[PDB]
Design a protein around this ligand. Structure first.
Ligand SMILES: [Mg+2]
Ligand SMILES: [Mg+2]
Ligand SMILES: [Mg+2]
Ligand SMILES: [Mn+2]
Ligand SMILES: [Mn+2]
Lengths: 334, 334
């Protein structure tokens, strides 16, 4: 009897809550989480066993992100106020998030404070203190009661692990030098996966804030998804970002280890849903239990555009962010 | 009897030649000089006395700009090959251009090489050598034979002067420290304008790669257009950019010195046509001659969107850039 599990994913939102360009000071139809959330609802309606994750580069990039750090830094840091972007994610009932490089742009304290307000775990395994301790929650495992194809309950332990590029040491040198170090993405995965398996994880989802190259690279690579898929063992699904590209896409047809039709790399489903909420990532897993152990019998990775599928703003996003958005308009209009 | 002179302006194109997103690897209708050039053609058909200028942040920003610096650096530097973006500008018969902050991202030598290939002058008055000499052509004056409203010829000397924000010393510290310095925008204008008037300039156009604030600022300001308009004398038209905003726009109604209906600041027409070719700036001057000297009798600044006015790519742009664009696709796809 199988379990059909769906994972929905956003990446590189870059603080675009509304379908709005603060620079031209105009509405747009082309991007924004208020539009992507319409796809999220649609997919949730299709499968009760649905998880929702974000892949980082979330809280920074436009004037709304600037507004939050300028006007609410102290209260966000203390946990008094929830970061307004995190409030949206909370309203949407995200199950997990992770850190992109741009999460570090406003300093470590603001990031810690941002994380404090999330209802869901925000994980990262490769950023460490100067003495070698995990600087963030490295992974989490949640026991989920999923419904199988016979309608029966199946308890399945789902784990999330996250990765950021080591190049944050360059990009955010001022904020980070002397305060953290960053372990190679693949080496972090290999160190951490065994622990997740020991602690009972049945399905492991990588929130890999890192892109895709067509061939192997060595340690320290900025865009390491191919290496994650080939050099590790135990990851069942990979969410990709950072490059602001699309995966799957036709360009990868004929590249060793890639299956464009299935959206897989080395047999593991991978999705990279563009940037700014222009696409939603969708991974389907068919889980099969044997010998008390779960495996992935079949999978697919796909992406869906908001273009042509979405024509209006999601009310949950709009209602949640509205005040902050109007505050941002005032801030921008000086 | 008057002369109607029209000035068309682009700004912050950021190497978007085609209406194409290299990151998602697909066509867009949203931006690109190939679309803006359709507005250029339309406006040129409306008035024989038309000038065309670019306001900087032109050669950098996307993978096409990267392709040029990576694959053609040596030949661009020597002047052996024209920068492909500059070939497009040459083909569209631009009359002048200027330096935005991003022109410095690839170093001083590459920028010098890029400029060598332009058929038109690229001016900048405020970047200086460490000893105080102008690092670039500070201004140019061209005697134009314009046609007045009686159909008669009128020789009018048009000058172009350009400015970049002094903050390039921070943004491009590695490329610039110890090699140039940057004079305050207003102070550069006040130093340079008298010389232009001495050399006979009748009409002076500022290619001001700098944005707009609603009230006065002091020396060293990043966004200095208000101060240019109020603290200098002798500028007849200002092209603004850098902020990626819109001007004229309704937000400025009721702000002292601003006239939204006419698109002026302190009586001088100003335009800021968004970014990436999403708008074309259009300034109309009605020039009158009294006693051997020209003055601007009436003026207007306006911007026009490619949205709703343009539905296809301009052939001169496409034909000129096609090979480079195809090479860029190969580069991006690896
Ligand atoms: Mg960063
Ligand atoms: Mg990133
Ligand atoms: Mg700029
Ligand atoms: Mn990003
Ligand atoms: Mn720009």
């Amino acid at each position: 009897p199988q379990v059909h599990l769906s994972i929905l994913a956003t990446t590189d939102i870059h603080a675009n809550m509304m379908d709005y360009d603060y620079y031209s000071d105009k509405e747009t139809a082309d991007f924004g989480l208020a539009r992507t959330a319409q796809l999220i609802q649609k997919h949730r309606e299709q499968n009760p066993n649905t998880l929702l994750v974000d892949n980082g580069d979330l809280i920074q990039g436009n004037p709304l992100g600037e507004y939050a750090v300028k006007y609410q830094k102290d209260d966000i840091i203390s946990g008094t106020k929830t970061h307004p972007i995190i409030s949206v994610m909370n309203a949407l009932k995200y199950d997990a998030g992770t850190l992109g490089n741009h999460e570090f742009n406003y300093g470590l304290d603001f990031l810690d404070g941002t994380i404090k307000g999330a209802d869901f775990p925000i994980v990262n395994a490769n950023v460490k203190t100067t003495s070698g301790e995990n600087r963030y929650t490295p992974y989490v495992i949640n026991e989920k009661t999923l419904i199988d194809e016979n309608g029966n309950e199946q308890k399945v332990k789902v784990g999330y692990i996250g990765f950021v590029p080591p190049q944050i040491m360059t990009w955010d040198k001022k904020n980070l030098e002397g305060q953290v170090q960053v372990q190679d993405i693949v080496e972090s995965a290999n160190e951490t996966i065994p622990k997740m398996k020991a602690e009972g994880a049945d399905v492991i989802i990588a929130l890999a804030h890192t892109g895709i190259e067509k061939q192997a690279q060595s340690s320290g690579a900025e865009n390491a998804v191919f290496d994650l898929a080939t050099k590790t063992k135990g990851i069942d699904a990979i969410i990709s970002g950072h490059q602001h590209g699309l995966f799957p896409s036709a360009e990868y047809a004929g590249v060793a280890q890639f299956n464009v039709e299935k959206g897989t790399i080395n047999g593991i489903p991978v999705v990279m849903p563009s940037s700014w909420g222009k696409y939603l990532g969708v991974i389907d897993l068919k889980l099969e239990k044997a010998d008390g152990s779960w495996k992935v019998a079949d999978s697919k990775g796909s992406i869906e555009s908001i273009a042509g599928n979405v024509t209006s703003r999601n009310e949950t996003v709009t209602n949640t962010i509205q005040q902050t958005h109007q505050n941002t308009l005032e801030y921008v209009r000086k």
